[PDB]
From a paper:
A new psychrophilic marine protease (MP) has been found from a marine bacterium Flavobacterium YS-80 which was recently isolated from the Yellow Sea in China. MP consists of 480 amino acids, is homologous to psychrophilic alkaline protease (PAP, from an Antarctic Pseudomonas species), a mesophilic counterpart alkaline protease (AP, from P. aeruginosa) and serralysin (SMP, from S. marcescens) according to sequence alignment. Similar to PAP, MP is also a cold adapted protease.
One Zn2+ ion and 8 Ca2+ ions have been located in the electron density map. The MP has a similar overall structure to PAP, AP and SMP with an N-terminal domain comprised of residues 37–264 and a C-terminal domain containing residues 265–480. The N-terminal domain is the proteolytic domain which contains the active zinc ligation. The classic sequence motif HEXXHXXGXXHZ (residues 186–197 in MP) for “metzincins” is conserved in the marine protease, in which His186, His190, His196 and Tyr226 are ligands for the Zn2+ ion. The distance between Tyr226 and Zn2+ ion is 2.58 Å in MP, but the distance is 2.94, 4.24 and 4.27 Å respectively in the form 1, form 2 and form 3 crystals for PAP. The stronger bond may imply that the MP has less flexibility at the same low temperature compared to PAP. In MP and PAP, the calcium ions occupy the same positions, with one in the N-terminal domain (the catalytic domain) and the others in the C-terminal domain. Unlike the PAPs, MP exhibits a more compact structure, the Cα atom of Thr239 (Thr222 in PAP) moves about 9.96 Å toward the internal side of the protein. In general, MP has more thermo stability and is more rigid in structure than PAP but is more flexible than AP.
Author numbering: 20 to 200, 206 to 480
Write the structure that this text describes.
Amino acid sequence: GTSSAFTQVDNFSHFYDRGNHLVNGKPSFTVDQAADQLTRSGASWYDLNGDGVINLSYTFLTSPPPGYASRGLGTFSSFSGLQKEQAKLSLESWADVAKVTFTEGPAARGDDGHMTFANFSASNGGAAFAYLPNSSRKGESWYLINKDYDVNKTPGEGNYGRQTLTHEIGHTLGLSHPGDYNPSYRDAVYGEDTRAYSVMSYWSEKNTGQVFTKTGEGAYASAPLLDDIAAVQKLYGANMETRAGDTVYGFNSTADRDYYSATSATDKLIFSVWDGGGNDTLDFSGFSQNQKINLAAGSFSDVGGMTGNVSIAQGVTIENAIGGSGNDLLLGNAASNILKGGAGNDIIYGGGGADKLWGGSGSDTFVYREVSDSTPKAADTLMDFQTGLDKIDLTGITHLSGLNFVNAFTGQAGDAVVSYNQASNAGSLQVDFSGHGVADFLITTVGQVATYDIVA
Ligand SMILES: [Ca+2]
Ligand SMILES: [Ca+2]
Ligand SMILES: [Ca+2]
Ligand SMILES: [Ca+2]
Ligand SMILES: [Ca+2]
Ligand SMILES: [Ca+2]
Ligand SMILES: [Ca+2]
Ligand SMILES: [Ca+2]
């Protein structure tokens, strides 16, 4: 057995596991499998000029292109200023993650490729459509506007008009729909075909249990989500220059993207973090609901009252996380993390590396899963430890076998020594789990630690 605080971190660390099991009766695909599914056509742009990027131009067509009239698309019209502004934000969010660049202008000798954007009015065409880069209509995307369907007239961050642009641009870059697919989620090839994993899915995140809204519509990611990032980087390479300095996501954002910025306790965030380097933070300090924040690359978090709404892209290391006033779980990664629980009763898991952990006010618990979480050459520091209030939980290591508190190691497994260094106001807990007679585990505290602060 273990304590509940360990069970909670363990279950949350595994709650969104992918691969090797069944999800809704379907095979579960890992990010990499889903990225190959999204790229199964093998279509791509080519770096025709060898400059190292796919450099594409695009036009907002102002009149019907040749061939338009025989296509049965009904009345042509051009993008409005709002559609143009939103289209460029969607383009920017693909260019952020992969070595593709987009410059407005007509087709030209130095271009790798050219794209077009326009509206059509015949409902028969669906909400939007686009073509892949190996087609004769490569670059084209098309958007439905008519008396029955106005979603595309008003794209805005978080809404379906905005995701439709990001989705159709995804096709132009070479992305398929997660499946071949009237059609419903029941036709999906793998369980993670929903709008929690890819903007290329049509199926509500409610299929896979995430909660973004009360209805399972209409809050939508504006920018490429975890599987989209991996799929597009597989085709074109990762854009490592993006956000390569220290970056904060969430409240107090320095990411400079509308979909990464929270300003209000009521904001609905749906995003996957792509970040190229530096010492970075997820700052979720502005919310009051209970949160679960996971800093593992590829993992999901339940943010701001929602679940499964924030993730970190494969290949990204995010160092720090700040919770809000709710009762939170904060899980670190293999790097040295700063984890800050804030108000409420929080459970912090540092994982690998020397972490600096802040419980904030309330009764906070610091959770340990492996001896390697906090070792004498790389020990956590519990920066605001409150003796008789906070808990150090070792139960995921001891499985409830307990510790024997001693003044020095005796060669028995489970011997532990807690000391307080008056000179530096530094507590320490050293534990010899193996029983070799020397500490194999060490946590330092700011303030004292007592035997009754330790759960084992
Ligand atoms: Ca090029
Ligand atoms: Ca960064
Ligand atoms: Ca980083
Ligand atoms: Ca908190
Ligand atoms: Ca860590
Ligand atoms: Ca706290
Ligand atoms: Ca505390
Ligand atoms: Ca650690």
